[PDB]
Design a protein around this ligand. Structure first.
Ligand SMILES: [K+]
Ligand SMILES: [K+]
Ligand SMILES: [K+]
Ligand SMILES: [Mg+2]
Ligand SMILES: [Mg+2]
Ligand SMILES: [Mg+2]
Ligand SMILES: [Mg+2]
Ligand SMILES: [Mg+2]
Ligand SMILES: [Mg+2]
Ligand SMILES: [Mg+2]
Ligand SMILES: [Mg+2]
Ligand SMILES: [Mg+2]
Ligand SMILES: [Zn+2]
Lengths: 173, 189, 51, 141, 191
RNA sequence: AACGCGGGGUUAAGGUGCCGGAGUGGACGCUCAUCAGACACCACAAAAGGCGUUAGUACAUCUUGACAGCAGGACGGUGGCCAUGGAAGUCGGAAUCCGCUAAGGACUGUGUAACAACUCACCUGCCGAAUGUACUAGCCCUGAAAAUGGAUGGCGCUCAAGC
């Protein structure tokens, strides 16, 4: 519930030498619409010669997942900055929505590469339709046939306020 | 990979052009046995094979060139070849069985059948009596020749052979290791 | 010494590698030193032969 | 050959396993996501035992000894409901010791002050017969 | 990256029996009894078939999984020793001073003792005590040979290493002075 | 964040295992150090390395059977044209053919005065899914030596009470 995917459409301000300017559309992941629009101008400034003071926003809409109850495999392309230089990566995730996949990606990059939110560009998010499109071995073991496994050494849940138990707890639940 | 590509068209053309397809299992046969059988049957019949074919003949079973090709799929196991010829099954029954070789021991090879040296005179120089005394086999120097008066068993059947015994068997020119082309079922005949 | 026994004894104190950083005696086919004080270095040389 | 092995034997997470959640609800596993999350739903007629369709974290669930046979992977709510009632999940869950413990706990928490007085007096009358019987067997040693 | 399932198997001959209880392994056979304690490893044992033992590790790390094959080999050696036994051989190597070895069987403790004399012409006398269950013997098939045999590979190997490590040359070039007692052959009592 | 004397409510910077008012709170990962680490100013550490572990980039091989191990084979001109008491691939000077196959050189190495043998390259029995090389940057490790007994504030902490 931290992120949502938005559609943002923007335009250069019309002038007499060019009425009816072109329209550009981007897909932005953001926690709210105030930072969705700020993110839009950031990316457009890097591609076209437009600013916020010489343009305007046309439309903002929320894109919802079409089947948020079906398990899917996702692939993501991204570009990030390390302490010296920039690099490209491709990672994979398994969940039920595009928003869930992006949230897991941001946590994963912070843990394994110490990359902050401010140094990551998302290039493309694609749902992998065929089971033959899975590349990473940590996903392949999850799409194996006839999967099943037990849960050994499970610690029982005990109220914090209850100190001084009178029996030795078990771990076979 | 060019030879392997050439092998594909070679197998595909040859199996169709030769209705008589034979199966031969050849395991541990020296180079000269193939060379002599190839020259002898260079005029008539072609002998050729290679690595095992699990889909190469499936490429032939895909079209109904021969419906029997799909009945030969489980037969191939390994190191088994095919024979193409224009002759008859009776004449090829023992045409490829000729020129059986006699292979010596490999210093520890298992002899399936028990071997025993017959009593008699060897007829060689007794200067190599160190070989016999190393194993402690009684030998007699008669007329400047080595003779074994009493029969001495060499090795129990199915038991390995020591290097000294293997050298003796090599110089005795007697061994039970005879190598030839083994036969296999052909076209469920 | 009989030649076979000379080979047998030489296996334990002649055929070795030596770490160029800490002089450790290492197996003949090694690629990294097994000692931590040099950081498992990979600069190895053979043990000198006696001629 | 004699082999004598004594070790553990756990219940496995699998398609068809029935879970029990924190608030006494039940659900059946239809799809495995990770080693920590599972997609499940329970289409039960009893409003106290039914749960919607969604993802459950395994840390907040317990594995019951009930497994629905031949439940297809990824089956929808209609197919699960048909298999749920054909097998008789509600009847099987009522015969377990977990259910009986829950029922006993509910009854004791619903006692009023007058009920608490009467349960004390009724226990004494049963206790009187217990002491007489225990004295008889112990005296005979 | 954790692996959901890793497994190994162990076949068992019809001449022996195996018991597992709280990760304590007991192997019983025609030549004696052996025990091993494996309570430092988190593993699950099971009976796969009529004469096959199974080993499993669930949700294991790369470091944790490496110990699965190790446990399999250790128990497998336990079965081999109880049914066939182990047998090491050692050889005397010297240039000038002959090495004298005397072996005696102690009575109070039931162990074997080995004494070494005249090593590079030294006056000191070396003594080593073998582990219980390990038997020593001077060879008669050839000269300057020792033979160690027993049921436990761990016991036989460590005792043989004790003899080899006690005879060392100090303050000399060991590429030139090669005297000592060294292991030369490893095998089984039967076959 | 700026100040008269008091009562009630809410917060800032900073905190919530104990000293100590308030979570042994929730989610996903990384780390095992015989010198771990633990919060701006601030009370220090570098060049250079690791087949420790984790993620990534590029190229190449492989169910027409790849890497490992074991097992078998390893042919004519041709002892090449030349050297020669002797050199047959292997003192030495100088090129590199086809038949035979799926397959062996007018040869890598050991070896003979020279042969031979053993090879080896190379191919083939067995096996059943991956494998090889070079790079990028996270935590940990090496690099890391001073004088009274001692300081993440202390105690202590390891799916943390560390990042
Ligand atoms: K916690
Ligand atoms: K690294
Ligand atoms: K502090
Ligand atoms: Mg000196
Ligand atoms: Mg106040
Ligand atoms: Mg906190
Ligand atoms: Mg407090
Ligand atoms: Mg560095
Ligand atoms: Mg290979
Ligand atoms: Mg202080
Ligand atoms: Mg604290
Ligand atoms: Mg934290
Ligand atoms: Zn070193």
């Amino acid at each position: 519930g931290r992120l949502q995917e938005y559609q943002v459409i923007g335009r250069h301000l019309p002038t007499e030498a060019n009425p009816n300017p072109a329209l550009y559309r981007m897909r932005i992941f953001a926690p709210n619409e105030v930072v969705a629009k700020s993110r839009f101008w950031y990316f457009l400034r890097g591609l076209k010669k437009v600013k916020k003071a010489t343009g305007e926003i046309v439309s903002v809409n929320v894109i919802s997942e079409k089947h948020p109850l079906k398990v899917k495999n996702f692939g993501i392309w991204l570009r990030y900055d390390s302490r010296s230089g920039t690099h490209n990566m491709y990672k994979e995730y398994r969940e039920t929505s595009r928003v869930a996949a992006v949230e897991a990606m941001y946590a994963d990059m912070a843990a394994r590469h110490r990359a902050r939110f401010r140094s990551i560009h998302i290039l493309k998010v694609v749902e992998l339709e065929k089971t033959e499109d899975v590349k990473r071995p940590y996903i392949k073991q999850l799409v194996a046939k006839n999967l099943s496994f037990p849960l050994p050494h499970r610690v029982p849940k005990i109220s914090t306020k209850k100190i001084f138990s009178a029996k030795r707890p078990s771990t076979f639940s | 990979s060019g030879n392997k590509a050439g092998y594909f068209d070679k197998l595909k053309g040859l199996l169709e052009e030769y209705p008589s397809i034979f199966v031969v299992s050849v395991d541990n046969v020296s180079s000269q046995q193939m060379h002599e059988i190839r020259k002898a049957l260079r005029g008539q019949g072609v002998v050729l094979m290679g690595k095992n074919t699990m889909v190469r003949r499936a490429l032939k079973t895909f079209m109904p060139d021969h419906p029997e090709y799909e009945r030969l799929l489980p037969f191939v196991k390994g190191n088994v070849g095919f024979v193409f010829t224009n002759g008859d099954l009776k004449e090829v029954r023992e045409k490829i069985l000729s020129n059986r070789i006699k292979a010596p021991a490999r210093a520890g090879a298992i002899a399936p059948v028990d071997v025993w040296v017959p009593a008699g005179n060897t007829g060689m120089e007794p200067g190599k009596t160190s070989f016999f005394q190393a194993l402690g086999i009684p030998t007699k120097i008669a007329r400047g020749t080595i003779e074994i008066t009493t029969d001495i068993k060499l090795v129990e059947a199915g038991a390995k052979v020591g290097p000294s015994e293997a050298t003796l068997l090599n110089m005795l020119n007697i061994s039970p290791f005879t190598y030839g082309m083994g036969i296999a079922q052909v076209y469920d005949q | 010494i009989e030649p076979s026994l000379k080979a047998l004894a030489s296996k334990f104190n002649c055929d070795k590698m030596i770490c160029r950083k800490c002089y450790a005696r290492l197996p003949p086919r090694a690629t990294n030193c097994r000692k931590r004080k040099c950081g498992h270095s990979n600069q190895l040389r053979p043990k000198k032969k006696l001629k | 050959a004699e082999i004598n092995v004594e070790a553990t034997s756990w219940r496995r997470v699998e398609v068809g396993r029935v879970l029990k959640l924190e608030n006494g609800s039940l659900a059946a596993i239809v799809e495995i996501i990770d080693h920590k999350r599972v997609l499940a739903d329970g289409p039960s007629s009893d409003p106290k035992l039914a749960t919607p369709r969604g993802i459950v974290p395994l840390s907040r669930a317990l594995l019951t000894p009930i497994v629905i046979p031949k439940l297809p992977r990824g089956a929808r709510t209609g197919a699960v409901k048909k298999a749920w009632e054909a097998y008789g999940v509600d009847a099987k869950w009522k015969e377990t010791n977990w259910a009986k413990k829950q029922l006993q706990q509910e009854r004791r928490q619903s006692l009023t002050d007058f009920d608490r007085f009467k349960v004390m007096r009724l226990k004494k009358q049963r206790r009187f017969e217990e002491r007489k019987a225990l004295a008889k067997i112990k005296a005979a040693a | 990256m954790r692996y959901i399932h890793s497994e190994e198997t162990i076949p068992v001959p019809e001449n022996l029996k195996v018991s597992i209880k709280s990760r304590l392994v007991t192997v019983e056979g025609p030549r004696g009894k052996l025990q091993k304690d494996l309570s430092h490893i988190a593993v699950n044992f099971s009976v796969v078939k009529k004469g096959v033992i199974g080993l499993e590790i669930h949700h294991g790390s790369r470091k944790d999984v490496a110990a699965l094959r190790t446990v399999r080999t250790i128990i497998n050696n336990m079965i081999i020793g109880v049914t066939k036994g182990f047998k090491y051989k050692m050889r005397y190597v010297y240039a000038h001073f002959p090495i004298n070895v005397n072996v005696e069987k102690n009575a109070e403790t039931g162990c074997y003792e080995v004494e070494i004399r005249n090593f590079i012409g030294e006056k000191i006398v070396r003594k080593v005590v073998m582990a219980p269950g390990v038997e020593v013997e001077i060879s008669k098939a050839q000269k300057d040979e020792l033979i160690l045999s027993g049921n436990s590979l761990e016991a036989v190997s460590q005792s043989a290493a004790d003899i080899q490590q006690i005879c060392k040359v100090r303050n000399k070039d060991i590429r030139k002075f090669l005297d000592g007692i060294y292991v030369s052959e490893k095998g089984n009592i039967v076959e």
